[PDB]
Design an enzyme around this catalytic site. Structure first.
Site, PDB file in Angstrom:
ATOM      1  N   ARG C  60       0.839  -1.206   0.000  1.00 12.40           N
ATOM      2  CA  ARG C  60       0.000   0.000   0.000  1.00 12.40           C
ATOM      3  C   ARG C  60       0.872   1.253   0.000  1.00 12.40           C
ATOM      4  NH1 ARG C  60      -1.854   3.017   4.687  1.00 12.40           N
ATOM      5  NH2 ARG C  60      -3.560   4.488   4.127  1.00 12.40           N
ATOM      6  N   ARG C 107      -5.674  18.992   6.928  1.00 14.07           N
ATOM      7  CA  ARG C 107      -4.479  18.943   7.772  1.00 14.07           C
ATOM      8  C   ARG C 107      -3.996  20.270   8.339  1.00 14.07           C
ATOM      9  NH1 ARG C 107      -2.792  13.103   6.387  1.00 14.07           N
ATOM     10  NH2 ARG C 107      -1.691  13.382   8.400  1.00 14.07           N
ATOM     11  N   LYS C 257     -12.963   3.398   0.736  1.00 16.12           N
ATOM     12  CA  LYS C 257     -12.798   3.607   2.162  1.00 16.12           C
ATOM     13  C   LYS C 257     -14.003   4.246   2.886  1.00 16.12           C
ATOM     14  CE  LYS C 257      -8.603   4.865   3.218  1.00 16.12           C
ATOM     15  NZ  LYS C 257      -7.515   5.888   3.140  1.00 16.12           N
ATOM     16  N   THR C 315      -6.307  -0.342  10.261  1.00 17.19           N
ATOM     17  CA  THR C 315      -5.949   0.721  11.192  1.00 17.19           C
ATOM     18  C   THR C 315      -5.814   0.272  12.634  1.00 17.19           C
ATOM     19  OG1 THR C 315      -6.507   2.522   9.655  1.00 17.19           O
ATOM     20  CG2 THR C 315      -6.453   3.126  12.024  1.00 17.19           C
TER      21      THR C 315
HETATM   22 MG   LIG Z   1      -4.547   8.335   2.417  1.00 12.97          MG
END
Ligand SMILES: [Mg+2]
Ligand SMILES: O=P(O)(O)OC[C@H]1O[C@](O)(COP(=O)(O)O)[C@@H](O)[C@@H]1O
Ligand SMILES: O=P(O)(O)OC[C@H]1O[C@](O)(COP(=O)(O)O)[C@@H](O)[C@@H]1O
Ligand SMILES: [Mg+2]
Ligand SMILES: [Mg+2]
Lengths: 518, 518, 518
Positions: C60, C107, C257, C315
């Site tokens: 990944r 962010r 996701k 995760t």
């Molecule tokens: Mg990402």
């Protein structure tokens, strides 16, 4: 829809999972008991009060550390915090005290001019282990003293030795007289008085030492509710613990901590001798390969559910909350799946004993357990618990399963049970109703011990005995009704199940009434 | 090892079948109700007394035959036989009286006495059918009279006419204003007043004729416990019978007889309209292909069970016992399978009305039913009845399912229920306990009507109503306890479940007790 | 007994758990895919070879960080590592490359000077959020910059703002046009460029930004195998990702996701549009309450299993292993439970991207997965998967379910499937055999993408197409046999199941043969 009502009704476990719904809120009541290890972060009366408010049911005192004096002063604090809420008996929460045995631990000595710091071992570096008590407080990167004098009989050339929650591993290379030379198979920062494990070694330390008997005798004097016995390996270990408690200690529950291969291998005799079980995953996953722990956990939880004896899932449930205000996604899942497997209690250790967020840890356990309890596939669970339980002639057992069945049938707000010793209520708990079991008792220790069982919300009646027994029975039922109402377990119009005995006895529960809450 | 208990614990139905045992004796109690048709072989007080001693529960009077005076006398004999046992309240059996309606039957007339006996119908012969009343009693090989005046409207050249339990068939070759010329397709011996069926011809006979109205009213007058209504094709048909039964007939159970294509097709509405169903296989198996009857039988039993409504299996269960003291192998299997499917009651017709072995047939039914009841797979049946049943707020419903659950858990000797109307007991029965349900009531009608439900053994209390209501309750309980002891249902050893209410209402059953038998 | 076979034969899930055995060794094959995030710790050719050996299936690439140039190098190294095993076709492992999209992330900027490094936010402190690019690289405890220019349009006074895996929390005291003033409620130390979450705000960033467009096109020219698309809220989002990929990237699998409340709510539409799903727990447990995440995980796994589409659990699975060589007990439990839930693949993030023990993290995942696969209750799972699938089909679906059944009946060593595009191996996977599915293909992209499905062990056949079809089939079958033997999946005497088309074609895999291994 609420309580995962849509999912509860699925014809398959698969379909049940598909129907789980994030926006479906759970019922108010939380069934799974929460046990918290008390230490420097949670010892003060004031934080102890918040902990009880947040959901703590049992205070665990870890006798691996501290002193009788220290622990006595902790127990007193638990009791002050707890009793600060007795002014209102409708909202008072009993709190149990549990004595967690040191047992047959192997510890390392002190680090040179201690505790001036720690040492670093490196992969490939070699280490001598000595039994020579000269080095007792002279441990550095070259020599390490251990307190287990027979270690040399029990290990061999090639044997692994784990030190400090198994993060460091050594391998015996040179054996020898009364000392061992090893190569660091796996290195790291080594501190003072760290735990040693010897997986697959025939370790001959007793489960009950003289010092364990002095701790246990202290627990009896301190009137604790339960004992968590460390490193139980066979039934006869459990019997020693109980006998040694003597007549004064007769009603203290014995919980066997299963934490080594022999414990798992002899699980059935140990279960038969014990009042319940703790899956002590910490030592268990060093003692056997870590990949295997969930197997032992699910095994033990199944068997305790099948036997009707409480099982506690313990250790690192929320470990990262020692340092952080939220758990990892692994930790949230671990608590939830312990509940879903069937654990009666979940436990916190470092996270309440020493962490920076004891209060957040307790709340998290409460919050997760209650989402997970709604997620249980009761349809299959109840059926399986029925099939697998024997026909008997005990009328209490028959009344208990009958009441749980009725409760499912009318979707009731509670099962209310009058109980002197706890037993009637424990009998209901065994069949895993979705509704909370309000156990009314006058025996304060019964109330405290009831927290070991999934579902039992214990309530301590303070009212004096009526002289018409029928009126006394009623006072207690009405008491249970006011508690449920005040806590939000149910409303004025709802229905509930009430279990009662025919005479003022002591073991005659045998009557089940389905009544609207007044 | 008694009552197919090894089989009862199997995890698959197949293993359960494998474990059925020919040397394992059943319990004393027999749970399936026995309905016997009363006529010339069974009508005297003496033989009625033996029939009751033999297990008869319900006496059916078939109004396709006889005069009101004839039936009045039969009822009076039933009552005399029943009351002969009243002198011992413990061993008395209530016996119900059932009235079976003529309904829209088509029958032939009387054969010419000569006295030939019967006329020989020969394949390929021609046979005239007439409606001219001058021939009503002059039936023979050349001319047959029929009492359905419209017949000529509803058939066509080539139509098929069935006579005498469908054994004789005629094809219409020629049509007339008030006659039919037919050809004998299926030959045989023709006697007097035989049933005619016209499958898939559009029959326009009313569901409730003037004669039926008369008979129903006489049933009311005569105080019958229930009516078996013939040829019900739709819910509105049931409504007529209820209308005609009126207020004085408030409590007479209406049992609808399903016996044609429409009755099956509209089954759900008839079931919702009726108090119960009879699978009337005689006509059913002429109205639809006979290989299909078992399918109808098993859907009606299934749905009545799912609805908690009494269903009765009837007709040729033990036919050959009309002439023989022991039945055919298909007859023994037929009876056993009806119970096994879930029929509440089984019925005898000719075998008790006219046969040479009325008492053997009754005994045979009692014997097979008790054997089959031990072989039911309750693990599965109880689980499926629960799944399929809705969550209610009815405390009595909760209590009933709780008592059955308890009954399996402690292997109960009986479920004792106090009921005035019967409901509380009907509610236990729909969950199909293995243990007999001893319904104690003071209402005599309720005690007779109880026989319609699998496993209810009604018991009639004659004792004076005590001053204190709680002592009156207890009295009824001790009554039932004595009757079960008297009859060998259970001994001082055992446990029984007692259902009770919180006030001398009349629908407040909410209490279950689990009680060792004193 | 091996393989938890004693537990497999249980009649109830409860008894299944009871029989789970620590001493029952699993098979050699491991069915659950392992996805590893490549980063500084894992990116060297030498480390990557060891990762493939330890069990890595998918590499990944997280495009939340790094330049295209950086990623192209990582990719080239992954291929160098993978291709270094191609000289032994028997032992070669296809390794997929996945691109994980940045998506509509929020962010913070860079701290410091002058910082230095961390910056301590204090519970009770006040923190100003700014949007002025002057502070972009000047963040500290007073002033914090964010890259979400509309944040002000979309939070309110008293909204909560979470920073860095939801560990820091802020409440908005005062709004304003391009700044916010806030109070620290959960303090901690704030690093550079941390993730920001606004739960219950309608954040309006596009599904596919300009940067995502550029990243996806880069994905196409690099020939990646799959795309993990972050923050998918709805089907049109997936359609946007598909449009960018275009004709040229047609065959690239899109895994959506699910990481916010709207994604869970619109799950069904998203799943229909997607090629699989990732349960992205990190963002998900900040967006919704952390107690609820296990509910969403289990609903998503169930529904993906029921649809036969790949699902990934992501995760913090072995989080503590970033700094430690053994995971916590919660971590081991989480991995097992994910596999027990039904997850096709499991994922590692920081633990292989940046931690000290990437190889041990892979190995641990491999060890637990395989242990958990032996513990599955196949008897129930298979029954449920067959009942929830339609009784329709389609010879190919029938053959696959027949194959999976034969495979249990004989404890097959494997199911060998010949497939061009993967589909037939996919079909077998959705029925969850316990035996590994060796999918033989000549298409290298098919072999790499196969790792998305539980149980599919892809094997890339490099030999040219033989002159007769039947010999071409045997070549590929025999190749599967050799790989199985070399890997310890089975031996000479064992039986395997082989699935095949009838004609030289592709799909229409309608032929099943049960063959001993030479
Ligand atoms: Mg990402
Ligand atoms: O759960 P235990 O200890 O058997 O106690 C149950 C007992 O409690 C009662 O309901 C009340 O008895 P007391 O009034 O003596 O407390 C009894 O009828 C019953 O036998
Ligand atoms: O089954 P039913 O007809 O509702 O009757 C059950 C009733 O019988 C009783 O147990 C006894 O009442 P009585 O004393 O009125 O006969 C009631 O408590 C209960 O409501
Ligand atoms: Mg300890
Ligand atoms: Mg009739």
């Amino acid at each position: 829809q609420t309580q995962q009502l849509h999912a509860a009704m699925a014809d398959t476990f698969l379909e049940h999972m598909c129907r789980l719904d994030i926006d479906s809120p759970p019922i108010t009541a939380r069934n799974t008991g929460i046990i918290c290890t008390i230490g420097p972060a949670s010892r003060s009366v004031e934080t102890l009060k918040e902990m009880i408010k947040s959901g703590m049911n049992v205070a665990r005192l870890n006798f691996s550390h501290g002193t009788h004096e220290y622990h006595a002063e902790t127990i007193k604090n638990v009791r002050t915090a707890t009793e600060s809420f007795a002014s209102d008996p409708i909202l008072y929460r009993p709190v149990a005290v549990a004595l967690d045995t040191k047992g047959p631990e192997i510890r390392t000595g002190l680090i040179k001019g201690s505790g001036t710091a720690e040492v670093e071992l490196k992969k490939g570096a070699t280490l001598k282990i000595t039994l020579d008590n000269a080095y007792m407080e002279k441990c550095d990167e070259n020599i390490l003293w251990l307190d287990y004098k027979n270690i040399c009989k029990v290990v061999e050339v090639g044997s692994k030795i784990y030190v400090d929650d198994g993060l460091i591993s050594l391998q015996v290379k040179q054996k020898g007289a009364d000392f061992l030379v090893t190569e660091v198979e796996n290195g790291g920062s080594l501190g003072s008085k760290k735990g040693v494990n010897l997986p697959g070694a025939a370790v001959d330390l007793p489960a009950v030492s003289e010092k364990d008997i002095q701790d246990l005798k202290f627990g009896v004097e301190q009137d604790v509710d339960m004992v968590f016995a460390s490193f139980i390996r066979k039934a006869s270990d459990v019997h020693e613990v109980r006998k040694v408690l003597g007549e004064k200690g007769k009603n203290i529950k014995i919980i066997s901590k299963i934490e080594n291969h022999e414990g798992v291998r002899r699980f059935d005799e140990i279960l038969e001798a014990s009042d319940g079980i703790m899956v002590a995953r910490g030592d268990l996953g060093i003692e056997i390969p870590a990949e295997k722990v969930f197997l032992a956990q699910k095994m033990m939880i199944g068997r305790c559910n099948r036997a009707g004896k409480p099982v506690i899932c313990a250790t690192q449930m929320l470990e990262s909350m020692i340092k952080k205000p939220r758990p990892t996604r692994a930790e949230g899942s671990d608590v939830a799946n312990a509940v879903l497997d069937g654990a009666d209690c979940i436990m916190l250790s470092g996270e309440t004993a020493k962490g920076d967020y004891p209060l957040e840890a307790v709340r998290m356990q409460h919050l997760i357990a209650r989402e997970a309890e709604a997620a249980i596939y009761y349809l299959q669970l109840f059926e399986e618990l029925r099939r697998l339980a024997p026909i008997t002639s005990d009328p209490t057992e028959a009344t208990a399963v009958g009441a749980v069945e009725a409760s499912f049938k009318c979707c009731s707000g509670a099962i209310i049970v009058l109980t002197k010793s706890g037993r009637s209520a424990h009998q209901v708990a065994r069949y895993r109703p979705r509704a909370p079991i309000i156990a009314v008792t006058r025996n304060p220790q019964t109330a405290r011990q009831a927290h070991l069982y999934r579902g039992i919300f214990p309530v301590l009646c303070k009212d004096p005995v009526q002289e018409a027994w029928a009126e006394d029975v009623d006072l207690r039922v009405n008491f249970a009704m006011n508690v449920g109402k005040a806590r939000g377990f149910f409303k004025k119009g709802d229905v509930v199940i009430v279990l009662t005995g025919w005479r003022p006895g002591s073991g005659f529960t045998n009557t089940m009434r389905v009544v609207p809450v007044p």
